[PDB]
Amino acid sequence: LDPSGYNPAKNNYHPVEDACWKPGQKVPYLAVARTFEKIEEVSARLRMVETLSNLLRSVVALSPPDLLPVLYLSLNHLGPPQQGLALGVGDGVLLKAVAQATGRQLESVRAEAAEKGDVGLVAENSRRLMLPPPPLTASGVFSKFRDIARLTGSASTAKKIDIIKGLFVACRHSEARFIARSLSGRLRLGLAEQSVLAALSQAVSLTPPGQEFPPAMVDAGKGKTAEARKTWLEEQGMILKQTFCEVPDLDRIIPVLLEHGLERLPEHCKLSPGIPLKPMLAHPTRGISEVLKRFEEAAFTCEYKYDGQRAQIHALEGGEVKIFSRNQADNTGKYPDIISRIPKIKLPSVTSFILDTEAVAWDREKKQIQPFQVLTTRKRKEVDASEIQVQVCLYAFDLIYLNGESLVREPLSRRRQLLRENFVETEGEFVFATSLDTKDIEQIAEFLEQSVKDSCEGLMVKTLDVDATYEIAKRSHNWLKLKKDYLGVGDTLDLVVIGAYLGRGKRAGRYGGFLLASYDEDSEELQAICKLGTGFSDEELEEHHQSLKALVLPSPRPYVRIDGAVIPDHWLDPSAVWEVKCADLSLSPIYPAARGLVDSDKGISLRFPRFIRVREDKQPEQATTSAQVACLYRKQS
DNA sequence: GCTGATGCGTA
DNA sequence: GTCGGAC
């Protein structure tokens, strides 16, 4: 019963006979590290989910109290999202911790990190007393995380490091690697919230919980054919997934799960205001072409695409209001002005609601929307409604809860109707999305032109009646986003490659990204405008490594200016011209491209740049000019 | 008390 | 946001 050889990958896995801790005992972390180890070793999701489910099966069998930590460890989360825990541990610290844990120089082990592309294997390969401290447990290592996440104030980083040295010198075998990876936030397991859910639902279904030990019922799949066992699990699979969608808070599910069992969960775990839900999202479309096929025979509506923050507004019985972002973080304290205007936006009939809206930066003096970059300069922290400098206008466009009742399983027509009926527009505080419902291949295209005129990113397009319900389990991108840059219309740039960046794991070794530049005629310089790491195939990314290998330089050219950009690992004789696409342009505090052209102190950078195509026809001389770029940014009114 | 390095969470 | 890998 040694865990150094534990194996949930095994075949005909017996939850008890194959475990590596006697029952009731605390689950070793090495089990987890092993599980993780056997997961990282295949690449097929369907294997990975069973191998996790094996660990879970045992955990449910022997040590039920450790189920929650084990799941949180596998998610690399610290707890429910709306509590806002955060490690506050970076690569910088994590390293200091490793260096102190082993001996070497900070820049020594730092070097080992940036050319292995992963701290986890810097951690463990490095050689911690004559005594091995007693071995790490999953409950403990979880609770050492939260301990790191609670420390704050002066000299908090010291204490943070100090716990990490502990964990490390107590690590055996591969633990020091997955511990290092979790704390760096890049667990990069291969399975996420979805698969962990798949594995958990397989595990309680295979090895049902609450059994008096030893459990009579170990594999509850035995009496079934393959076809039977498979669509059985998928069924239970969808029980857990959907229920979690409505209530995505493990600390409340896992108890209930354990007591009344999986199939009865959806009657104790009701969608309720006060718990942040993951919002519904969409999918791009090439144009009003791809529209009429995905939607086919179903009336749709058309809504403005708003360049703001999605905010999801919860209203309990008894007046407590809380406001949540799309990541389920609590944003209430961030928005006191909206907590105050609540009574002015509901009919006093309304006792409880959940609203799907989009907070946009709004100018009062001129009655017009300001772009997202302005909005981002709100204070996050505990505000006082007095000192708001950047007003915000809410754009409500759906309804999930109304007076005790969940509207999830009901069509958008209905959902919009009740929203139109119980809530009240007040211009530049709270309105409905500017809309149209219509099907004409032309008047739609006229409405987009008018939206993008209004300082909006494009058009949302939502089915009114067919499939137009909200349930984000069976799908979670079920409307369509008609942009302008998804279209031949989208305005690209041709920019110059002036350096390269070494990659991180899954791209460590090869070039991970590039720093690009625009040509400034007046000073004759190349000014770095942004970095680029998105959207070349692995093969194209070596086409580049082989066509830039000749051009590596030890020093920048003198006519290249990057200001406070990240220094490339490999500077590059300036030769390669790529076609780059971006959503919008922005006023950069660190990029010199076109500085002074549009603002006394800030050049311009690209939000969300992706690489499209190389341009062999263009020399660095014919790329986009900083003059042209300044003109581009202005064209965003 | 301030500043630079950076973690985190908006896009 | 949108990407490619690998199923």
Add this chain to the structure above:
DNA sequence: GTCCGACCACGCATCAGC
């Protein structure tokens, strides 16, 4: 088509080091 882990600018909050 789905899931996963990447990539990016930017600004507020936080803390070590001065």
